[PDB]
Design a protein around this ligand. Structure first.
Ligand SMILES: CCCCCCCCCCCCCCCCCC(=O)OC[C@H](COP(=O)([O-])OCC(O)COP(=O)([O-])OC[C@@H](COC(=O)CCCCCCCCCCCCCCCCC)OC(=O)CCCCCCCCCCCCCCCCC)OC(=O)CCCCCCCCCCCCCCCCC
Ligand SMILES: CCCCCCCCCCCCCCCCCC(=O)OC[C@H](COP(=O)([O-])OCC(O)COP(=O)([O-])OC[C@@H](COC(=O)CCCCCCCCCCCCCCCCC)OC(=O)CCCCCCCCCCCCCCCCC)OC(=O)CCCCCCCCCCCCCCCCC
Ligand SMILES: CCCCCCCCCCCCCCCCCC(=O)OC[C@H](COP(=O)([O-])OCC(O)COP(=O)([O-])OC[C@@H](COC(=O)CCCCCCCCCCCCCCCCC)OC(=O)CCCCCCCCCCCCCCCCC)OC(=O)CCCCCCCCCCCCCCCCC
Ligand SMILES: CCCCCCCC/C=C\CCCCCCCC(=O)OC[C@H](COP(=O)(O)OCCN)OC(=O)CCCCCCC/C=C\CCCCCCCC
Ligand code: HEC
Ligand code: HEM
Ligand code: HEM
Ligand code: FES
Lengths: 378, 49, 98, 74, 81, 96
């Protein structure tokens, strides 16, 4: 009788960590989920120190940022590990969703839906956080994206003013976003605990998609060091990205102090929201781009219903794989289009990329799932 | 109207991945800043430290 | 800017298709003799000069911009027309704005 | 004062900026530019602007200049 | 619940395993390791790459066409005469 | 700022504390901005207060050409070419 199995606290550490069975054949992709947790742990503490110096007012915020970057000891390292740590969080997150789209992990539908809720909370979090610097890009990013709420027919403007706390973006709004952006991640942690809670009672999926009870393995000796290798590679990419070229992934012309009087020439959202932005800018009429913006993230819930293949894993279904990487290329298309100024060549490709983005996940996939069902005589 | 000309890249000393800024140039450049620049340009965030 | 009827004439007279940022004159202001506008230029935030310019309307020294009496941009770098604030007349001597 | 020493300084930016102009890309861009200029002069109310061709010239110009300037400066 | 003591039944499937210290951490790396990675790449390659190649053509076209859309300012004045 | 506009025909000279990392192309935008002052193109005209610097996005910067040879004499005793001047300026701003 090991001490871990008698202690009520240790039983949770024993089941959730040290002794839960895992498929033997798990690959690199399953590391990313754990990385997300670590990223959160990094996004909190690092960001927490920024909270010790940042002052959420319309005037003092930017100067407080200069105070962090300069007068504060090692402050710039914190600000860059934080700001780039968020982008790393979205890299790991997009890949983490992508493996779920690939290996058919979405059949764990409740965990899937909770994951979607974590996705939306993460988007509100990063968005409200990007407003904090109160640079040129921030004021107008928040201005436009909050002007999107103008679209709703009856609530429209009254709702927007209720978010602004006034007739325009200003100090009270910046304080609003400071509080909400300060509070959401801690909700994200609890929902993540729910996420693992709906995950562990069924067991982790394996890349083959076949049930793997015959070859389960204790999590500790192997996956603690495998995940540790993942943490080390993650710190590799993050520390290189911050200590060598911190601003390549950042946006220049954000550093200029916000001018309500003046609109920056290009004005774009930071890249991880940005693909969705196309679905806005491509669609005609102010409201339809909003509904398309909602459907763009909310389809994911619709996806498990659309499953038609008698299998699970994508690896045994190459025709689906072609559509899958086609869809990923379509996402890159949406990002590059969203990185660009309005013009016919861009708008056309945006129309096509959007409509293709929906047709691939609604129409095309189930049908070839059926065709693959018939190729193998089911 | 038409978008502005895109500036050529230059073989700067500090653009090396490991190479550092040359402080003598920073000194001489500050000595340029004190006269020609300072008459009509603020630097809000830099102290005499 | 309360204004002379002749400016209402020259503003109404202008061809609409030619405008850099087209917008019908009478369709803008609620009453043509009055023109209420944000005082900031739409280009780079400089404030246009009142009672000046080729049209006798507005002019921006910062980069030579030319606004008409109705405040629509024409000559110069500036893209879209001067913004029109929401407002309403109440008592005839008074005008609420915003 | 003495004009010479001013004459002496010359500057290295200008000298480099001429040798690159001597090269054929800057030459064809230059003659095409002057062609655009003369075409602009040809009529009383031209809408054409040669600034575009001026960019076509200056881009390859200063790009060629970029390889050689800090080689001269210390 | 689904602890190791109670999962799927299975019947006489014998297995063999050496101690970590009894064997090299990098067995036959060149003779078998690299060719394996190469076979794997050769399997994934045609499945994965072409869509990305398709993406590139579009990316190149879009920028280039946009260049025709804007940088060919002289075509419009040329149309003026 | 309003006085600064009054002293500069309404133009406001930007703070140089982050002028490098703000502009696209960074400090590369700056040196070329100083080094370059081509005479105005035929067929285009602009206000006398405006000055034609092609690298400026408005292509008509309000700033007068700030530097020329021997505007200033370095204590280091190094020659005061406008190129060396603009180079030292961009280096110092980059550090700034
Ligand atoms: C910023 C982006 C985020 C970071 C990069 C992506 C994340 C990497 C990751 O998590 O996967 C690691 C994962 C580790 O192997 P794994 O645990 O067996 O993953 C399951 C395989 O997919 C099992 O499938 P497989 O056996 O068929 O192998 C798939 C893989 C075959 O490659 C591999 O199996 C392993 C490659 C790693 C070798 C290390 C080389 C030296 C370092 O196919 C390819 O890599 C495509 C060919 C083109 C890449 C050529 C260069 C690769 C080196 O490596 C990959 O599968 C992808 C690596 C390709 C990276 C991009 C190269 C450019 C294209
Ligand atoms: C806020 C977060 C809300 C969601 C809580 C998720 C944690 C619950 C949990 O781990 O269930 C264990 C359960 C595994 O144990 P089990 O063998 O299935 O038996 C379930 C009973 O917990 C076996 O123990 P039991 O039969 O004695 O169950 C009674 C116990 C069950 O309570 C728990 O299971 C643990 C709840 C508190 C966790 C310790 C917090 C440390 C920070 O009820 C309580 O302790 C009273 C409720 C206290 C929690 C109230 C939270 C809202 C106020 O679920 C898992 O697979 C663990 C993974 C969940 C996430 C863990 C990773 C991050 C931590
Ligand atoms: C030594 C230097 C180590 C460099 C990094 C180690 C591995 C890095 C990696 O991504 O692999 C996945 C590695 C875990 O997979 P693994 O167990 O090492 O690979 C399966 C075994 O190799 C079991 O499969 P295996 O038996 O087929 O392994 C053989 C092969 C295939 O191993 C792999 O599957 C990929 C790892 C190959 C590393 C070779 C490094 C050579 C440089 O490994 C090799 O030795 C490749 C031969 C290359 C020639 C060696 C000399 C270079 C010339 O790390 C991760 O968990 C991926 C983290 C992704 C998140 C990072 C954050 C995203 C931004
Ligand atoms: C903008 C820049 C942002 C950067 C984000 C990076 C995301 C781009 C990911 C692209 C990676 C391309 C490398 C792909 C490597 C590859 O082809 O692996 C082959 C391998 C086949 O393996 P098997 O099926 O086991 O076959 C074995 C045969 N014996 O295929 C896979 O690995 C598929 C599983 C990986 C899933 C991760 C996909 C990453 C793309 C994420 C975007 C899509 C998510 C969309 C959700 C958005 C919701 C808002
Ligand atoms: C008062 C004369 C004056 C001096 C001398 C001067 N500046 Fe400027 N500068 C201005 C003004 C005014 C502007 C605003 C340009 C505009 O509004 O179009 C400006 C613009 C700039 C810009 C570019 C802003 C942009 O939007 O691209 C930089 C960089 C700059 N100043 C820094 C400098 C540097 C470096 C020097 C070299 C000593 C210098 N200033 C000297 C007045 C001056
Ligand atoms: C803060 C955000 C998230 C955290 C901390 C998190 C954490 C985890 C962890 C640790 C796992 C264990 C398996 C693994 O690590 O790969 C997992 C599994 C899973 N997650 Fe997430 N996740 C997050 C976001 C998401 C999102 C956005 C989705 C879906 C859109 C999602 C859906 C899933 C699914 C379907 C599994 C099952 C994988 C399997 O069974 O092997 N999660 N999650
Ligand atoms: C998943 C969780 C989080 C993400 C993705 C995130 C993301 C971001 C982003 C993108 C910025 C903008 C920084 C910039 O552009 O320079 C930011 C700023 C900031 N964040 Fe977070 N954040 C998270 C959680 C937190 C937490 C938990 C705290 C505090 C406990 C926090 C405090 C701050 C502060 C004070 C700033 C202003 C500093 C600055 O703007 O440089 N954040 N965050
Ligand atoms: S500032 Fe109004 S035109 Fe440049």
């Amino acid at each position: 009788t090991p001490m871990r199995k008698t202690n009520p606290l240790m039983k949770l550490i024993n089941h959730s960590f040290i002794d839960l069975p895992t498929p033997s054949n798990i690959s690199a992709w399953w590391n990313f989920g754990s990385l997300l947790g670590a990223c959160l742990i990094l996004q909190i503490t690092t960001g927490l120190f920024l909270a010790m110096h940042y002052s959420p007012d319309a005037s003092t915020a930017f100067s407080s940022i200069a105070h962090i970057t300069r007068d504060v000891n090692y402050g710039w390292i914190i600000r860059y590990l934080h700001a780039n740590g968020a982008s790393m969080f979205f890299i790991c997150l997009f890949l983490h969703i992508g493996r779920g789209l690939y290996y058919g992990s979405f059949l764990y539908s409740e965990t899937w839906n909770i994951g979607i809720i974590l996705l939306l909370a993460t988007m509100a979090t990063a968005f409200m956080g990007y407003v904090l610097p109160w640079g040129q890009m921030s004021f107008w990013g928040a201005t436009v994206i909050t002007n999107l709420l103008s679209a709703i027919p009856y609530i429209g403007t009254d709702l927007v003013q209720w978010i602004w706390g006034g007739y325009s973006v200003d100090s009270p709004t910046l304080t609003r976003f400071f509080t909400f952006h300060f509070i959401l991640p801690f909700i994200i942690a609890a929902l993540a605990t729910l996420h693992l809670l709906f995950l562990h009672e069924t067991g982790s999926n394996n890349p083959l998609g076949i049930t793997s009870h015959s070859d389960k393995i204790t999590f500790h000796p192997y996956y603690t060091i495998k995940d540790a290798l993942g943490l080390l590679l993650f710190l590799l990419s993050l520390m290189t990205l911050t200590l060598f070229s911190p601003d390549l992934l950042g946006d220049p012309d954000n550093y200029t102090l916000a001018n309500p009087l003046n609109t920056p020439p290009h004005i774009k959202p930071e890249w991880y929201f940005l693909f969705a932005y196309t679905i806005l800018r491509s669609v005609p009429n102010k409201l339809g781009g909003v509904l398309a913006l909602l459907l763009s993230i909310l389809i994911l819930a619709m996806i498990p219903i659309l499953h038609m293949s008698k299998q699970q894993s994508m690896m045994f279904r190459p025709l689906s794989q072609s559509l899958y990487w086609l869809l990923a290329a379509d996402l890159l298309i949406l990002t590059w289009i969203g990185g660009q100024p309005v013009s016919y060549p861009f708008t056309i490709i945006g129309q096509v990329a959007s409509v293709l983005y929906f047709t691939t996940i609604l129409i095309l996939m189930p049908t070839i799932s059926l065709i693959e069902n018939k190729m193998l005589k089911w | 109207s038409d978008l502005e000309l895109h500036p050529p890249s230059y073989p700067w000393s500090h653009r090396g991945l490991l190479s550092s800024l040359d402080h003598t140039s920073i000194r001489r450049g500050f000595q340029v800043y004190k006269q020609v620049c300072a008459s009509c340009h603020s630097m809000d965030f830099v102290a005499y430290r | 800017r309360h204004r002379t009827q002749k400016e209402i004439e020259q503003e109404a007279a202008v061809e609409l298709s030619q405008l850099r940022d087209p917008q019908h004159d009478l369709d803008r202001v609620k009453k043509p003799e009055w023109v209420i506008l944000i005082g900031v230029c739409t280009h780079l935030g400089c404030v246009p000069i009142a009672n000046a310019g080729d049209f006798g309307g507005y002019y921006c020294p910062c980069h030579g911009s030319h606004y008409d009496a109705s405040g629509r941009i024409r000559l110069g770098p500036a893209p879209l027309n001067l913004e029109v604030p929401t407002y309403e007349f109440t008592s005839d001597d008074m005008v609420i704005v915003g | 004062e003495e004009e010479e020493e001013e004459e002496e300084l010359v500057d290295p930016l200008t000298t480099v900026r001429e040798q690159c102009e001597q090269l054929e890309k800057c030459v064809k861009a230059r003659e095409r530019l002057e062609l655009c200029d003369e075409r602009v002069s040809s009529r009383s109310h031209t809408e054409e602007d040669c600034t575009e061709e001026l960019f076509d010239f200056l881009h390859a110009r200063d790009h060629c200049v970029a390889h050689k300037l800090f080689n001269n400066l210390k | 619940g689904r602890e190791f003591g109670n999962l799927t039944r299975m019947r006489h499937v014998i297995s063999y395993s050496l101690s970590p210290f009894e064997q090299r951490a990098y067995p036959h790396v060149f003779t078998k390791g690299i060719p394996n990675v190469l076979r794997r790449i050769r399997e994934s390659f045609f499945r994965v790459v072409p869509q990305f190649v398709v993406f590139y053509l579009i990316y190149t076209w879009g920028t280039e066409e946009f260049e025709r859309s804007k940088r060919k300012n002289p075509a419009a004045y040329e149309n003026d005469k | 700022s309003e006085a600064a506009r009054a002293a500069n025909n309404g133009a406001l000279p930007p703070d140089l504390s982050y002028i490098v990392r703000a502009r696209h192309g960074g400090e590369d935008y700056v040196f070329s901005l100083l080094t370059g002052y081509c005479e105005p193109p035929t067929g285009v005209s602009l206000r006398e207060g405006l000055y034609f610097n092609p690298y400026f996005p408005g292509q008509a910067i309000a700033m007068a050409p700030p530097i020329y040879t021997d505007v200033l004499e370095f204590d280091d005793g190094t020659p005061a070419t406008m190129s060396q001047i603009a180079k030292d300026v961009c280096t110092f701003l980059r550090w700034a």
